[PDB]
């Protein structure tokens, strides 16, 4: 914040080597996950005994789901809908059931309602996307439909990610039914009223809940993005199976057990990774962290200054001198020793001597 | 001669210098361990949060991590200054 | 680098805070400068590096252990060697080298000792 | 279902198993770093309920055992007499349940609504015409209705000897059930001549991970009946098994400080929760 | 606060108390160090 | 104990924050040890 500079060394503009290229490695599996089949099914399990399918070991593209946009509601939690493909997740689950349009809001994290608190409750930390879309034509017939049921009464609240398939008649306190089901005694089941004549507002909605967890183990629910040839010994951006880090990649000495997929240092930061396709083990390091220090005699004295990078190894930077403290430029060193006008560190001092440098 | 023997046999004489070495090492280590903590955010790693969240939503999570990291650094710098001052006093006593 | 990491998006959010980043860096830089200052004051009390005489006529006082040894590297005394033995850029944090090297500090200490006897 | 006769009823023998069955908590590899992970472990010096599957007189017992998170099974076998396992809630063929065979091909597994009999087993007979041990009655189950998961593990080989001797080998397993995933861990230890669990430290290495939703209250073990010519010759009384021994220890949430070697094998581990001294180490 | 609020709503509420209280501790702990360092210099004078 | 209080739910959030809880206790203990040292230096000037 001055137009004149006193003699000395000042540190400014810390530099880190830029990543020259980006390489993405994914597991080599080409079998499309059958998300489509789950989405279109003749029968969807009712809320009391919801249908759940575990999809893994295959490649699903979510663009069609996001892209198709034929669904009334596509709420997404903790995951950007547009950004879905880039992220890779493991342990994906699917839920199937149909509830009325009014109760669609109820099936969400931290919400109340009869079916949500009595039939199916989403966890607070849920990280998945919920899809809804009417199928009125499918839910309308000449004789109607009433195989879709939702529970009215239950003694205690249903747990998150758990389902009740049990059938037993409702009871409160005393006057136990034992099958009686009169007044204060009820059957567990309750049907629906889906009819063509019936209004849209309460008309059936088909709801699918897509839930996934990420960064636990090697998982194969990875997006359609294409892989690339591995690059070594050069600072470059990299992604491995939905895991992103940037550092130098080199062949790694350390042995790996078959179960293990990651390596870590003392600070619990990524230290090693295995390319899934290759089977090799490699070490990741940051390219360089740079403190740039400018050495100048003064503005009054001179307009020439020497720049030093402390981290630099004299090759990392994209005249040249090598000093223990740092790679040094703009200064020609002299063999004899002089009193330290400026202190560069590691027993090195830079001074202006005169023809002038 | 005795002093040579004493130095080679016990580390008690060099204890004070090491406390400085250990104390500095511990302070640096705590800051590094600080990064792992979520600080109320969805996930600890900065890149991971950005990758899976859209910009407005990404913002809240990013903010929490920034706030937590700032606190970590503040503690270190504040902690470091007190230790620096303490060491400074010793040097003033020591030089004299 | 520590607070917002590599990502530029995250760095912009940090800018809103303003003077925090700069303040922290300055304080640490000041501390480093202060640390460098301590060594100079404690060890550099002599303009001239006096060198002990070849003659061992010290009136029966054996100073061989305290004084530098020509056979051993870094010109560190035997007592000093024992002391050195006993004491024992990772992620955007860099430990700058000391202004004065260990070997250089030994010469100042050797000089003071040499000066005292002679 | 077919039964068995003349069993001896005695109080369960007890032993103390110490620092056994520590299993690599997760997938990370670390070198020369001490790490503390809050993952279910058999408590050190935890009480272990020993079991006997040996005739000795007229002794044969393999009843149902209660199952919690800590389902650490440590069988000791020589002529490979204990083979499989049963998991489940009520084994009613109405709630989804787990089941295995330990064949020379694989540890074959399944998730099926199987109707088990009251006395399931594996049967092997010594034929005079050809010296080989064949399955006689594989009526472990009735049928299967719905099977949301089927599975075969990696190939390995088994000796299948028909002799008598001290248990030349050791097998440990830790069954667990967490966050909708069923998991298992294993190690073969060539321990020599110790009736009790061997003094020392060995670390289980995960063998398989299966994603399942099955909820299982309790589990059972499978025995190999050593059917011969001297036996009566029926499914209720015709059997002379031989030596078997297996120990079950439960798993509870505990914090272990696990030492990691340069290579990464967990050479040694100290339990913070177990002792006053031990707690100091965690803090330290 | 916990009795009145359920876990989804309670987290944001409870979090604010935690954040505030953390600041009180740090401020107290930082103050002690400053006072302790002053006493240490002070104590040494007395010792001297 | 101070920040979270007796309740278990409050404790879980504190775990998320990090080693702040643990670090603050360490600093105080260091201060506590120092007090003994000061008194020791000032008054233990005599062997017997
Ligand atoms: C799995 O099998 C069971 C039979 O063990 C099936 O339960 C029967 O299903 C039909 C059709 O819903 C009912 O009419 C019967 O009443 C059920 N059995 C009993 C005993 O009540 C079940 O449907 C099958 N499930 C799957 C997912 O295929
Ligand atoms: C797919 O990966 C496997 C295992 O890494 C490898 O053997 C195989 O050749 C790969 N195939 C191709 C065509 O890249
Ligand atoms: C980087 O590393 C050392 C540092 O002295 C030295 O070999 C040289 O400066 C560089 N060598 C390389 C990159 O091979
Ligand atoms: C000084 O001590 C050393 C080591 O004990 C010994 O070798 C030497 O003889 C002593 N004195 C002289 C005058 O050499
Ligand atoms: C093991 O169980 C027995 C009961 O048979 C009990 O007396 C004993 O205290 C237990 N052992 C240990 C070490 O807790
Ligand atoms: C597990 O099985 C038991 C009966 O053994 C039953 O009470 C319990 O609710 C089941 N729970 C789940 C949550 O699957
Ligand atoms: C495992 O460690 C040993 C002992 O430290 C060492 O020889 C090497 O790093 C590894 N070696 C073998 C050869 O199994």
Numbering used by the authors:
A (entry chain C): 304 to 621, 641 to 676, 689 to 691
B (entry chain A): 932 to 1027
C (entry chain A): 740 to 827, 854 to 883
D (entry chain A): 15 to 70, 76 to 303
E (entry chain B): 980 to 1027
F (entry chain B): 740 to 787
Tell me, in the authors' exact words, what the paper reports.
The ectodomain of SARS-CoV-2 protein S corresponding to the Wuhan-Hu-1, S:D614G or [S:A222V + S:D614G] variants, hosting proline substitutions at residues 986 and 987, a mutant non-cleavable sequence at the furin site and a C-terminal foldon trimerization motif, were flash-purified (1 day) identically and used fresh. To investigate this possibility further, we determined the cryo-EM structures of both the [S:A222V + S:D614G] and the S:D614G S proteins. Overall, the structures for the two mutants are strikingly similar (RMSD of 1.332 Å over 3193 Cα atoms), especially at the level of the S2 region, although we can observe small conformational changes in the position of the NTDs and RBDs. These differences are particularly relevant for the RBD in the up position (RBDB), which is involved in the interaction with the host receptor, ACE2.
